[PDB]
Amino acid sequence: RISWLGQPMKIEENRTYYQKVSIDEEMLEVGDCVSVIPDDSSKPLYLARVTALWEDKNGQMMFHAHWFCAGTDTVLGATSDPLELFLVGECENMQLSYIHSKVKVIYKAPSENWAMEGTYFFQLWYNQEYARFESPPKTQPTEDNKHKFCLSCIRLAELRQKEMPKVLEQIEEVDGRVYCSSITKNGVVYRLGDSVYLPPEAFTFNIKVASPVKRPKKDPVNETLYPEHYRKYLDAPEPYRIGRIKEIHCGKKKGKVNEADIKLRLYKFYRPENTHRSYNGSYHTDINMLYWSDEEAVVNFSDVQGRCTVEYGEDLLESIQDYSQGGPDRFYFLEAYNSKTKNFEDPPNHARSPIKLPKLRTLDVFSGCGGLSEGFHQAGISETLWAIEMWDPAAQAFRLNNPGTTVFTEDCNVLLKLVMAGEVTNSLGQRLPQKGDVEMLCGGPPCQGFSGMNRFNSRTYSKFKNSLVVSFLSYCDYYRPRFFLLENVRNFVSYRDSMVLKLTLRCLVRMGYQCTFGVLQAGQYGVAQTRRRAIILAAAPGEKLPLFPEPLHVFAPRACQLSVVVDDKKFVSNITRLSSGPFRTITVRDTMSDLPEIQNGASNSEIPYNGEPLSWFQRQLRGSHYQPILRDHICKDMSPLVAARMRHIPLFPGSDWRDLPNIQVRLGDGVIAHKLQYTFHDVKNGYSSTGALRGVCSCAEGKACDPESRQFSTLIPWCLPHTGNRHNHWAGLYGRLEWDGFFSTTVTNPEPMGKQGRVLHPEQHRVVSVRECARSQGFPDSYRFFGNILDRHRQVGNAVPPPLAKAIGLEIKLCLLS
Ligand SMILES: [Zn+2]
Ligand SMILES: [Zn+2]
């Protein structure tokens, strides 16, 4: 029994809208919230806010339903509050007769005294694709639409407008094609003369590139000399193509422009490695130097990945260095390249041209030596005034690099209790930060004792409440910083069925924080290392929630699975550059080709560079102004035996322990290592080509371990064949880095037979040095470390690479504007 109330608000041709409707003699109004019963008795009750009421010519009495999302249908899942709802951009038109009931939905707004703190309700807008919880839109109804106003609809509408290709300015039609001077897509304006990013396969270069002369693959292998050789049964994409726009033309459909058919005709730009110089010719060139060319390419607008600035070197008002560091996607050229005569020349003339941010006061918990704080400092967004680092060498390291920061070498739990208690100072006179002092809180809480995937139970759930991850959040709750950053190892998101991640997102939401999570790969921000980190970003109610930085460098695909599965739902970050990118990858070579030769065990912490920077990367890390000191080019002093094994790993890419010869070697002691003996069969690995046995223990046949079989002082480590079968023949152990490759995750203590053992230098017979490890992270050469060599390695391997941290910093920098 459904009848309207009051006089109609507005009339259309097919619809008349109303402000009030009567359903079973009960007032319902635009703005009220409502429930609808699912056909599936097992799904949670449907809940919507009524955004509009209207009547059809055909007698249908309608309302527009803007749905809420229940907590358990977001990342939080079963951890979220039963009565909490979240806004989402999902709505549709439904007939009033489907409504089951009125509901009360309260907007729990953040209090005006929010910073000092610490019927369904809602507080945040949930983005289900990126797992972002964000402040609700501020958008208000205008008189014109006050009758149909739907937050969901406007968001979908605004999106459609941003996403779609639209031509802003037409010139003239020529031979069934309209030529344009300006177009737009996804919020970016592209004009004639602008440059564009394109997939590697958008177009081709006219230079001929001969497939290498190839090579035999060794000769036969003597298996008595190499009894373990038998166990040995560039993948990063190309960076973007770049082109200057020459013409822009699209077809016509039904006498109007067909915007799904916009085409751009471009001048190809050459990267140095695209000319014949290839890689051997560009080791030393700037990552953003290009070469002009008069080659033209036709491309679909749909393929344009973004806009970039490309300038002729001489027309610049600033210095090449200054221009380059001035903004993102800035390239330059100084010569043209004739693809036909392979020569470089001057550029044609038509190729030529025509509020200081306050720094956030920052507290860095579990600071380490300051890799994370260094990255923020570089972005210009923060000032770490307080750092907490319980382990003394690292704490001292932090002081060396941040003279201005109060470093508390102490347990974070007792420190927070001290401030909560109103104490102004710890026992050492150090002034504790107080409520209001801290604007940005960041840190990497060691999430120990949650690895692996067994369930969580009564006993495990509590230690989480008593873990350092909870301590970090307790900090967030007390200080209520404007921005919150939690860094960790990738598996933070998957620890204990993703329950650690879910409890930490639940916690940030309970406090009223906007928040999200994602995985990033340090390699993609200008470092030659695989290092995936989980990152939790949070922003106070009044702020913008940051985005994750777009990858800058192409990197090995296997190391860039940044996506996370939580209860079978796949979450991704806002990152859009899912394959290629602006800059070529940074190699082990870019990283440390300028460093003087040192020997196993070298201990002189100050030696001169005996020769200038060679890589773009080395120019960045050594600086533009003076320093003569190469600090920490020191390496661990290995056993005579371990040193000998190292002299014997061949220098070919992929070499490791299985390449070792079964020979007697004179050690540095002056001792001789005897030969490893094979006196057991391997039913799984068989006999060798020299008719030799391949087992070094009785368990290989397979029985049980033999009391005496074990062998000592042998070039081929006795144990590696012992258990080779169980561990893919221990590939990588005593393995050399490749000049063309990248570091495995940079470790706290580099050991050839350790967890991560690809730690031998590519040419010298030694493990990598403290400096090289600092370079594998993104540490400047001026960055200081402290303690013995093992202390310094630990500090370096633990840090967040400043280039990753900086990347995160610039995204926060965007949130201080807009
Ligand atoms: Zn809607
Ligand atoms: Zn055995």
Residue-by-residue DSSP string for 449-489: S--S-----HHHHHHHHTSHHHHHHHHHHHH--SEEEEEEE
Instruction: For the beta carbon of residue 316, count every other beta carbon within 10 angstroms.
Output: 13
Fold of 123-146+357-592+779-818: Rossmann fold (3.40.50)
Alpha-carbon gap, residue 544 to 527, rounded angstroms: 28
Angstrom distances, CA of residue 517 to CA of 193, 315, 499, 533, 637? 38, 43, 14, 11, 41
Residue 26 · residue 55 · CB < 8 Å: no
Residue 727 CA, ligand 2 centroid: distance in Å: 14
Cα(815)–Cα(788) distance, rounded to whole angstroms?
A: 41
End-to-end CA distance of the chain: 50
CA distance 717 to 753: 9
Residue 672 forms beta bridges with which residues?
Answer: 666
Ligand 1 midpoint to CA 66 (Å):
5
- Kindly indicate whether the domain formed by 147-202+236-356 is annotated with CATH number 3.40.50.2300: no
Looking at the CA of 64, name the nearest ligand.
Answer: 1
The DSSP call for residue 399 is H
SS3 809: helix
Instruction: Name the token pair of 685.
Output: 């690995």
Those residues with Cβ within 8 angstroms of residue 179's Cβ, 6 or more apart along the chain or in another chain: 170, 171, 172, 173, 247, 248, 249
- How far apart are alpha carbons 499 and 505 in whole angstroms? 10
CA-to-CA dists, residue 630 to 200, 460, 607, 613, angstroms:
39, 47, 5, 12
CATH number of 593-778: 3.90.120.10
Tokens of 461: 């759930």
**CB burial class (10 A; 0-12, 13-18, 19+) of residue 110?**
middle
Q: Which residue intervals of the chain bear CATH 3.90.120.10?
A: 593-778
Contacts for 207 with CB less than 8 Å, ≥ 6 apart = 274, 275, 276, 339, 342
Residue/partner pairs of 417-424 with CB below 8 Å, 24 or more apart: 419/478, 420/478
Resolution in A: 3.1
Measured in Å, residue 777 CA sits from the centre of ligand 2 at: 39
What dihedral do alpha carbons 634, 638, 642, 645 form, nearest 10°? 20
CA of 82 to the centre of ligand 1 (A): 25
Task: Compute, in degrees rounded to 10, the torsion defined by CA atoms 505, 34, 54, 65.
Answer: 30
> What is the Å distance from ligand 2's center to 50 Cα?
72
One-letter amino acid at 273 equals E
Ligand number with the minimum distance to the CA of 722: 2
Task: Classify 405 as helix, strand or coil.
Answer: coil
Ranges for all domains in the chain classified under CATH 2.30.30.490 = 1-122, 147-202+236-356
- H or E stretch including 565? strand 564-566
27 CA to middle of ligand 1, Å? 22
* Nearest ligand to the CA atom of 708: 2
The torsion angles phi and psi of 568, rounded to 5 degrees, stand at 70, -10
CA of 150, nearest ligand number: 1
Torsional sign, CA 324, 326, 330, 333: negative
d(CA 114, CA 561): 37
Residues within the annotated binding site? Answer: 367, 371-372, 389-390, 411-412, 800
Could you tell me where the DSSP H helices lie in 148-241?
151-163
Handedness of CA 323, 380, 391, 801 (dihedral sign): negative
- In the chain, the largest separation of any two C-alpha atoms, in whole Å, equals 105
Say how many Å lie between the CA of residue 17 and the centre of ligand 1.
15
**What is the number of other CB atoms lying within 10 angstroms of the CB of residue 804?**
29
Cite the residue boundaries of each domain of the chain with CATH code 3.40.50.150: 123-146+357-592+779-818
List the binding residues for S-adenosyl-L-methionine: 367, 371-372, 389-390, 411-412, 800
CATH 2.30.30.490 fits 1-122, yes or no: yes
In this structure, the dihedral spanned by the alpha carbons of residues 746, 747, 753 and 754, taken in order and rounded to 10 degrees, is -130
For residue 18, give both structure tokens: 């109303």
User: In angstroms, rounded to a whole number, what is the distance separating the alpha carbons of residues 729 and 738?
Assistant: 20
Of the bound ligands, which one is closest to the alpha carbon of residue 726? 2
Which helix (H) or strand (E) is 297 found in, with range?
strand 296-300
Residue for token pair 């991640």: 501
Distance 754 CA to ligand 2 centre (A): 20
- Per the CB < 8 A criterion, the answer to whether 48 and 28 are in contact is no
Length of the chain (residues): 818
Q: What DSSP character marks residue 728?
A: G
Secondary structure (H, E, C), 627-677: CCEEECCCCCCCCHHHHHHHHCCCCCCCCCHHHCCCCCEECCCCCEEECCC
Among all residues, which ones are annotated catalytic? Answer: 447
* Dihedral, 574, 576, 579, 580 alpha carbons, nearest 10: -130
Ligand 1 centroid to Cα of residue 123, in Å, is: 19
Positive or negative: CA dihedral 140, 144, 148, 154:
negative
581 class by beta-carbon count within 10 Å (0-12 exposed, 13-18 middle, 19+ buried): buried
